[model samples]
Structure formats: C-alpha cells, structure tokens
Target: VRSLNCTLRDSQQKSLVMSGPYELKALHLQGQDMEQQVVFSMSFVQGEESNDKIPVALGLKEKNLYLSSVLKDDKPTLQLESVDPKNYPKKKMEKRFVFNKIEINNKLEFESAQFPNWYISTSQAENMPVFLGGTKGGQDITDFTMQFV
Candidate 1:
C-alpha cells in the first residue's frame, strides 16, 4: 500500500513520493505556514531488521515498525502502510544533505534517477519525487503540501 505524492511551494522546495507496495519505515515531512508564519520539517528513515525490535499487536513501537498509523485527509497526517515490503528488499540507497534540504532514507534514493535501468530493479517502474516547488513535470496533485502564505 504505497502511492504517496507530496509537494511544498513558496521557494522553500520540498517534495515526497512513495510507490506501490512498501515496508519502508519513517517518513514525516510536515511543513506549514499561513497565519503563523513558518514551520518546516523532515524525517526519513528506511528499513533494517538486523535484530528485530519486537512490539507488534497494533501498538507498534518500532520493532522495525511493521505498521504505524497517522492518516486522515487534506493534510491532516500521513505515514501509513508498513510491513517491510511484505517481506524484504534490503531497501538500498541512503543519502542525506542539509543546508538546502534532502532527507531520503534509501529505497534507491526515492527512485527517479531518469531511470538508470530501473536503479535497483523492481519490475522497472521509477517515478518518485520528480521535483518540488516546480510542478509541471515535477508532480503536485496534492497528496500533501499546501501553503497559504
């Protein structure tokens, strides 16, 4: 269960995307600014179960977090769908850069590399993020990201 698309504008630049079927953990990018003025954020953490943390039973406490919840609508909250890709993918690609902002926690660097032979190969379907605050060929049909100021 993965089909995420987020975008933030006003020159700050921000975009997020998740594709079909996922078990990738931790992804929360909530930015706001309307009447309050400023509120930006970034949190992305991928998969890894070298020991298995334990804490199942619908109360998930990050034993590798099989399933966590926090989704509503029209920018209420999101980060649903998790179970380790229903199995595994090793989820390669972990890159982080600051000063400007980029916190993708692997999964082939959030895909979309112009399609370098389907990066890590998952039936060859690469189209993630695209570009934020740029729209058009970048993507922004509102899965998140809305600014009023």
Candidate 2:
C-alpha cells in the first residue's frame, strides 16, 4: 500500500482545518496549531502503478472518508462522510468512496469515481464547508495543492 500523509490547501491557499468537532472547513489561519490542521492520508486502494484512474482512499481522523448520497445546502451534490476517529472501516468501500487524484497544471483535484462530474470543492469564502462542484472552475473554488508529510 503506497500511502502519503499530506495536508490539503485550496488554490486560494487557505488550509483545510477541522474548525469544529464534526465539521471540516477552509480556514485562512497562519501558523496555527498542528492539531487544528488536517493531515490526510492518501492511501491508494490498488497499486499506484499501472493505473490512470488513481483509485485512492482518503483517511482523516482515522476512518476512511466517503462521498455520501446525502445532500447539503452549501454543496452541489453529495456529502463527504466519515470523520469519526473511532476505528478503521473494516469492510470494503464502494467505488465512489475511492476518488481519482488528478493533476493538471501543477494543481491537484479529486473526482468521485461513482460520480465523476462532482469534484471535491471548498467554499468561495473562508469558514465554509468542504463541498462538491460540477462545471465550476478557477477560484469558483475547486482547485487544491498539497504538501506531503
């Protein structure tokens, strides 16, 4: 299993912080506490080799995060679930839960395998939840870059 622990920041350069107990938001904090910022573990489901789709499992707070069918007001479609740090998801995850990591022009993005059109996105303003978007571009707020730890 090829895995890397990294932090995600939006194109706006705001760090993705778990501002609340159960809420993950894009925050513009400079030199904040390490625990406040999230270090996502990018675990490739299959081998990173010989695959263009780049099937990957994103884990934060221990449990593997998944794209839920539930909808949210701030998002275009689907909610990102599994922030519980209880234990690992000892079962198999669906295809949508495994996102495809995409790199274009030196930026990174995640596209849901089950719903390819809905890309993981953040809000336009600070303190907004990490949402989803389709047909949105630029700081229309869906670009990201990461630093591997």
Candidate 3:
C-alpha cells in the first residue's frame, strides 16, 4: 500500500505568522506510467509566503494526486487549517510555536499555538519519538471544530 504524510517544521523559536492565505508551489508527487516509465507533475499555484517567523493566519488548499491503479476517484479538495502544537501534545510545556489568528476557511483552529520547549541533552531515546516541551505553558480559547476549513 502507498503511504502519505505531511508535516511542517521551522527553526523559529518564537511564534511564526503568515497573515495572508498562501499556497505552496506544486509538489511533484510520484506515480508509475508504464512498465518502465514514470509520471511526475507538480501543482501550479501562487501565494506561498517566504519563510518568516512573524505570526500570521495561514491556509492551504489540498489536492488529490493518487494512483489510478488503486483509487479511481480523486479526493475532495480541502484547505489545511494551521494548528498550534498544543492541540497535539498533552504536555503544556511541550507546546511551541505560539500562533496568532490561526484558521482555515474562516474558522479559528488553534490560536496562540506554541512549540515544545526543552531539548534532550543526548539521543538516549533516539529511536523513540521524544517530545520537547514548549517554552511557555498555556492554551488559548481555540478548538478543532473552529479551526479547519
């Protein structure tokens, strides 16, 4: 079976922002064309913002680029709602990348999102998924239902 996963990471220690809606340049998802041939094409669009730490609301539209040999129907398009790390990690300290006005399709998702603070001194549990808590401890008035488009 084919697997797909997408996640974004930044070096920014503070809350990062992107005020306007932006679309990442089309990415060339891979596929098989023939016995010895392959097909590759990227999504075409404009508005992806340059990397900046300034906190701003951001949204991204999703497109389906699946294999024809498997699922014959394309998936419905959906915008990605920006979510603060607090929603995922239970530890208040693990929240990092504090966000402001995070939403998608006009609903608040995880406002004031923060990244996990503290770092592991060494890679003792390198094989395990260790979480680094957030710099500060707090959660804002935000929920998942209000966030996604």
TM-score of each: 0.17, 0.76, 0.16
Cα TM-score of candidate 3: 0.16
Which segments of model 2 are wrong by more than 4 Å? 33-35, 47-52, 61-80, 83-92
- Residue 38, candidate 1: alpha-carbon lDDT: 24
Better of 1 and 3 by lDDT: 1
**What global local distance difference test value does model 1 have?**
0.24
Instruction: Report model 2's TM-score to 2 decimal places.
Output: 0.76
Candidate with best TM-score? 2
Candidate of highest lDDT: 2
lDDT of 3 at 76: 18
* Model 2 lDDT tens row, 1-149: 56778888888888887655555788786863545788887767742323345767676735456444334564446455764545543334455456677776778777766665677788879788886677665665776898978
lDDT of 3 by residue, 1-149 (tens): 11112222111111111222421212112244111211121111122223331233222223222111111134212122344433421222111222332334543332223321222111121122212222223321122222111
lDDT of 1 by residue, 1-149 (tens): 11122223322232322333332211323455222222222222332222321111111222222222222452212232344534421223222111112122311122212211111111112233222121223333222233322
